[model samples]
Target: MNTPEHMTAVVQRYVAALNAGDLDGIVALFADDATVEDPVGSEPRSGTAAIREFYANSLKLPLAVELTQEVRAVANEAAFAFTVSFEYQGRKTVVAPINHFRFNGAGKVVSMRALFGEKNIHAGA
Candidate 1:
């Protein structure tokens, strides 16, 4: 029986990659044609090249990323809340987003949605 273990592992791996500033590691978790709709309503990125570019831009800063909550996984989807922190322009900005991942049968992530609104972001030194 296929449990949520695979999806959970992917989420765990993703967080670890993010925290380590490992762009290649993070992108490796996705399928070639995966779609990433970060910030929920933003334009979604498709395919490996777009996905790679998206992560490359995100990792431009040294982020202190963490999984702030327990992973909620079921079926082929998993959701978890996490915070991405970095110092920009002499001040610190923190974005707490609840990211959702949908995995394909081969255990590769096919879709990623990062849900966060203006209120979810904290800006300060």
Candidate 2:
């Protein structure tokens, strides 16, 4: 794929904001009705307000995310593979997930899904 400009730009911007630990900044990148399915969990997330809440709660922890292997856009859809490192219960954790983002007509990300690998969770035995 040649890579769609809008998706490519948005993905880059989103990652930049994410790495900065700016939850509100990243959330602002989405549309008014955007939704996100982050982390490898059974429950799926929806709505802008809920998504904001998700970020709010998540930011409470010491976490930082950066895009490592992300594919450029194809048909205005971009895929991102990233690593999220955080501290939980006095232990450090790293989560790497491949995320897919879909942009609405207005070029704002309207729908996104994130799937993580088994190694994403670092729970000490």
Candidate 3:
């Protein structure tokens, strides 16, 4: 069973891993057959291999990630709001997104979805 404590801990660890640009650390949190649908509309990345590539591309530039609110967890699901900031072409941008995770019986994330849109993005000075 995936306890609330366990699920919340995973959310914290995920934010930490992203901030540290720890690709393997981030991937380790997911199940082998997990699926990721970032931003809700984009193509879903299924399986560990695709997920690895997705994070690899994202980690190309160092990111500053932080949770903005307490995690909400029930049963095997968890949700949290966070910000991901990165610099590109000497300009910094921040995107605030609410992400949801579904944990498997073994405590690994089996499904992940990020909810956000253009309005959630801000230019940083």
Candidate 4:
């Protein structure tokens, strides 16, 4: 959280790894029992192996964006919002979402879930 050193460095490294397309490098930031849910209520991706496959297969998309914005952290948890874009089967996918991450006492991300939905929705417009 406001534990400046640990929170800042770790979060930066995590995002940077993703931006660099280093899936394995990013997963290394999670705890051994970590859970990463890119989207809630589907299937929760847990552990290093599962996370690895998730990212590995994910990069196959025509494009993938890894980023962080509007992050707020307190205690051992952090919330970050991001936007990812890619083309799959000729459909453009652009999702802007939020993620809630809980860090262990050791300051490693242990439980993380992403909340995202479709973009540019104008109800009844």
Q: What 10-residue stretch in candidate 4 is worst by lDDT?
A: 116-125
lDDT of 4 by residue, 9-111 (tens): 6767766776567776788888888887877777888878888888787677643555546467787888776666666566666666777888877787898
Instruction: Report the error of model 2 at residue 52, Å.
Output: 0.5
TM-score of 3: 0.95
Predicted model with the maximum TM-score: 3
What C-alpha lDDT do the candidate models reach, one value each?
0.87, 0.74, 0.92, 0.71
Q: Which clashing pairs does model 4 show?
A: none
Q: What TM-score against the true fold does each predicted structure earn? A: 0.94, 0.81, 0.95, 0.78
The regions of model 1 sitting more than 4 angstroms off are none
lDDT of candidate 1 over 1-125, digit per residue (tens): 23697777889889889888787888899988899998889999999999988898888888898888889989888899999998878988999999998886788888999999999999965
Per-residue lDDT of model 3, residues 1-125, tens digit only: 58999998899999988999888889999999999998799989898999999998889988898899999999899999999988899997999999999997899999999999999998956
lDDT of 1: 0.87
Q: How many clashing pairs in candidate 4?
A: 0
On lDDT, the leading prediction is 3
> What's the CA RMSD for each of the models?
1.4, 3.0, 1.2, 3.9
Model 3 regions more than 4 Å off: none
Better of 3 and 4 by TM-score: 3
Q: By TM-score, highest first, what's the ranking?
A: 3, 1, 2, 4
lDDT at 86 for candidate 3? Answer: 88
